[PDB]
Amino acid sequence: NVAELKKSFNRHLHFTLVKDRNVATTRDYYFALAHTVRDHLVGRWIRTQQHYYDKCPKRVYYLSLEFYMGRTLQNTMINLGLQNACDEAIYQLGLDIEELEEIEEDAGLGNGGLGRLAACFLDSMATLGLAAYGYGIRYEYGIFNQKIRDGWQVEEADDWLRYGNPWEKSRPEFMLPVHFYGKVEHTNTGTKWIDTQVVLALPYDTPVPGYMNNTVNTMRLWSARAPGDYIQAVLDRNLAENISRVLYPNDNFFEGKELRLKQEYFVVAATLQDIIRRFKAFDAFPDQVAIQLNDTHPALAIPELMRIFVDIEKLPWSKAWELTQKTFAYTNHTVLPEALERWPVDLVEKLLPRHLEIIYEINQKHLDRIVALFPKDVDRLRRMSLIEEEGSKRINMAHLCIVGSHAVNGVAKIHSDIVKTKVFKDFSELEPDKFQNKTNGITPRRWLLLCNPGLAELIAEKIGEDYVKDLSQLTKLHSFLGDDVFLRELAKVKQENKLKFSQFLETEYKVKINPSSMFDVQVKRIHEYKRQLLNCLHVITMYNRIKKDPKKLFVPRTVIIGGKAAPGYHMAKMIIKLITSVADVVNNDPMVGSKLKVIFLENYRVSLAEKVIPATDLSEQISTAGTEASGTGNMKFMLNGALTIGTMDGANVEMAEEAGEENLFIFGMRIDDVAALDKKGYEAKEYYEALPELKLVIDQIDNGFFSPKQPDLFKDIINMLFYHDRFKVFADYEAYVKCQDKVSQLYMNPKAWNTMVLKNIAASGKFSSDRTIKEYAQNIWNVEPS
């Protein structure tokens, strides 16, 4: 009870932090609390892992280069059902728990959607009581902290481990060596990989508590450690430790840096040896082991498992290749060509010479089969080989992932279809059953219970709390479609969120927020395919309109656009500057006043999403049709009371399917409209003329209305937009703006706006990661939710 939580807290402050109430810092209080909460995890954690050893159910291994975990304290208190008791204990000790919680750094070991999907999967897998493990890398530095300077993004090192991480547990007894470079030696004993450089891998375990179910799983992250001048030799140990130093900040973009390849083989080698070791405590290996490949990043795992089976375990190739396919499953997360992993055979040859041999082997057996089925289709061979002979020979990691796995899945109906029927038509045709779909999901714990306590409560007061573990239960909120009191209560919750988040924007930015305006938000990583630009074109279009007619009845808006750009992404940085430039001109214009305010949410990250999302009314999901494989921010917003304005793309389609197309503000081109416009040939100049408001928008940008001191500042954008916009911004502008007006129309009718919201929330059940995982478990890993 509260009493014991307070005693424990004091115990830790004293013994663990060596402090008194007269000298304890705010940080000391947070750590003391974390420890107090952390202790409640031990019993179950040991019990859970022990239970997996005893009953030996098939285990699931989620192998990913990223895990966008966020903060742990609160999530752990909720899932353990200790939040209310802790809130009380901390209150009685004269402290502000919210204040202590803010001290915790986000474990931002991910770039965005992909990394966050891994985090939601862990929570779900633990909640469904599955024997699942997350295997990744413990980056000393996660995704950079974003700061805006002179309207531009500046990167600062995210030194999240500086003051310590109470949620991680070093597991020194499981350290393992990883090999790099060296050479292949073909002898009578077989193929040996010798003269390699060694790097030690030290695993760090982090508990993953299921929601109210006694289960605490593990996320094992590996850290790299080192195994002429003496002083300099010691310093060069840093070179080996550089492997797990920092997470590559690219979202949907392939950068073929050697260090990156090292990280990939690193996590792959350590993980597989650790799995093998655990297994031997091989015919039944795939009946006990399931390894999910999160995108092609861990593709090397396939030839590494083979290498272990063949070179170390001495199994015959045929047998080894069979077990491998039954062990792996591959998830495809993108369609953009510049994101595709294609490593130069030269780099791989030098760094992983034995693996290159193995990949060649795989390809040989693979291609021989194709001929043994289509003896004359010559172009089909090169089209299907894991090797791209064009110019400089490179490896198509996706193809390696397809042949080395028994199942390949996309992350949304539309996406999976494109992956199965177009992108990999040749492979799907040969192995029909291999390709599947598994529509993404988000955990309703962090993205509802934790981030929106007001909503969670309102809902539970109307239909009970069964919905937490079975989100489909939300369909019962339909019974309240005509209930005016409930609808007023729904909007009240949304209002409290907006008021709390406003006070946040107030202290952070010198802008007076119209608490009654509509919160128009587009938060996600900055990328042309995501179109923060199109949105920006709209904001500017609204600016002008107010100038021309400042008396016109206008629904006030607070437009929020936030997200980080990859350091080496020039266009994204230009767009950020463009937006901050626009914001300044709009925010300070005397005629616009509290009618329209533009904010660029700085340092958008998981813990910040938990704040802004619940305070949103309008969710911007406007990616060009066919570009966003699925999206998950769209779901978070849907579940949190916001209406969506977007294209029929990724999971947006299924959101319309569930809620009813009429209850979402769909617009612009669809997958086929994009195809047609391609064949014809896109010429942005035409819309620039046919659409008068656009021309004005564009001219102001290019003329320097938003960049006086630098008239041609944004020329790079104009240039791209007019002759190199592979994402057709102008082509959806008319429909987009047209759609936006309608959004404001509905907003004026509170009763109708909230009616549509209710239909959205009541239809979000399908997007719970719990449903996603049950499908993965049943149709891919073949494991049972206990």
Ligand X SMILES: *Cc1c(COP(=O)(O)O)cnc(C)c1O
Ligand Y SMILES: CC(=O)N[C@@H]1O[C@H](CO)[C@@H](O)[C@H](O)[C@H]1O
Task: Give the annotated binding-site residues for AMP.
Answer: 20-22, 53, 277
Q: Is 616 a catalytic residue?
A: no
Residue in 631, 641, 646, 668 binding ligand Y, rule: CB under 6 A: 631
Q: Name which of 251 and 610 has its Cβ closer to a second copy.
A: 251
Residue in 73, 117, 450, 582 binding ligand Y, rule: CB under 6 A: 117
The one of ligand X, a second copy, ligand 700, none whose footprint includes residue 238, by CB under 5 to 8 A per kind, is: a second copy
Residue type, 556: P
- In the three-class reduction of DSSP (H, G, I as helix; E, B as strand; rest coil), residue 292 is classed as strand
The one of ligand X, ligand Y, a second copy, none whose footprint includes residue 524, by CB under 5 to 8 A per kind, is: ligand X
Q: What is the DSSP string of 569-617?
A: -HHHHHHHHHHHHHHHHHHH-TTTGGGEEEE--TT--HHHHHHHGGG-S
Specify the stretch interacting with ligand 700 by CB under 6 A; choose among 168-176, 508-516, 579-587, 656-664: 168-176
How many residues interact with ligand Y (rule CB under 6 A)?
17
Query: Are 203 and 175 a contacting pair, CB within 8 Å?
Result: yes
The one of ligand Y, ligand 700, ligand X, none whose footprint includes residue 396, by CB under 5 to 8 A per kind, is: none
Residue in 83, 244, 252, 517 binding ligand Y, rule: CB under 6 A: 252
* Residue 630 binding ligand Y, by CB under 6 A: yes
* Residue 633 binding ligand X, by CB under 6 A: yes
Q: Could you give the CA distance from residue 727 to residue 535 in angstroms, rounded to a whole number?
A: 13
Residue in 198, 235, 481, 676 binding a second copy, rule: CB under 8 A: 235
* Residue 567 binding a second copy, by CB under 8 A: yes
Q: In what order do the strands lie in the sheet with 342-344?
A: 342-344, 394-396, 387-388
Q: Nearest CA to 766 among 758, 774, 756?
A: 774
Using the structure block, give the residue that is written with the tokens 């965005």: 112
The one of a second copy, ligand 700, ligand X, none whose footprint includes residue 31, by CB under 5 to 8 A per kind, is: ligand 700
Q: What is the DSSP string of 527-550?
A: -GGG-HHHHHHHHHHHHHHHHH-T
Kindly name the residue from 438, 494, 525, 597 that is annotated as catalytic: 525
Q: Which of residues 429-448 bind ligand Y (CB under 6 A)?
A: 440
Q: Name which of 303 and 633 has its Cβ closer to ligand X.
A: 633
* Residue 157 binding a second copy, by CB under 8 A: yes
Q: Could you give the CA distance from residue 210 to residue 631 in angstroms, rounded to a whole number?
A: 24
Q: How far is CA 329 from CA 293, 325, 423, 728, in A?
A: 6, 8, 18, 35
* Residue 133 binding ligand 700, by CB under 6 A: no
Give me the least distance between CB of 143 and ligand Y, in Å please.
12
Q: Is 525 a catalytic residue?
A: yes
Q: Nearest CA to 458 among 477, 433, 444?
A: 477
* Residue 20 binding a second copy, by CB under 8 A: yes
Q: Which of residues 199-258 bind ligand 700 (CB under 6 A)?
A: 207
Query: Are 302 and 400 a contacting pair, CB within 8 Å?
Result: yes
Kindly name the residue from 215, 296, 632, 772 that is annotated as catalytic: 632
The one of ligand 700, ligand Y, a second copy, none whose footprint includes residue 630, by CB under 5 to 8 A per kind, is: ligand Y
Q: What are phi and psi of 289, to 5 degrees?
A: -120, 135
The one of a second copy, ligand X, ligand Y, none whose footprint includes residue 440, by CB under 5 to 8 A per kind, is: ligand Y
Residue whose C-beta lies closest to ligand X? 633
Cα angle vertex 374, ends 372, 379, to 5°?
A: 120
Q: 709: which DSSP letter?
A: T
Cα angle vertex 128, ends 165, 272, to 5°?
A: 60
Using the structure block, give the residue that is written with the tokens 């002898």: 187
Residue in 87, 155, 489, 693 binding a second copy, rule: CB under 8 A: 155
Q: Could you give the CA distance from residue 468 to residue 151 in angstroms, rounded to a whole number?
A: 41
Q: Name which of 29 and 447 has its Cβ closer to ligand X.
A: 447
Which residues are identified as catalytic? 333, 524-525, 530, 632, 636
Point out which residues bind ligand Y (CB under 6 A): 113-114, 117, 251-252, 295, 333-334, 339, 411, 440, 628-632, 650
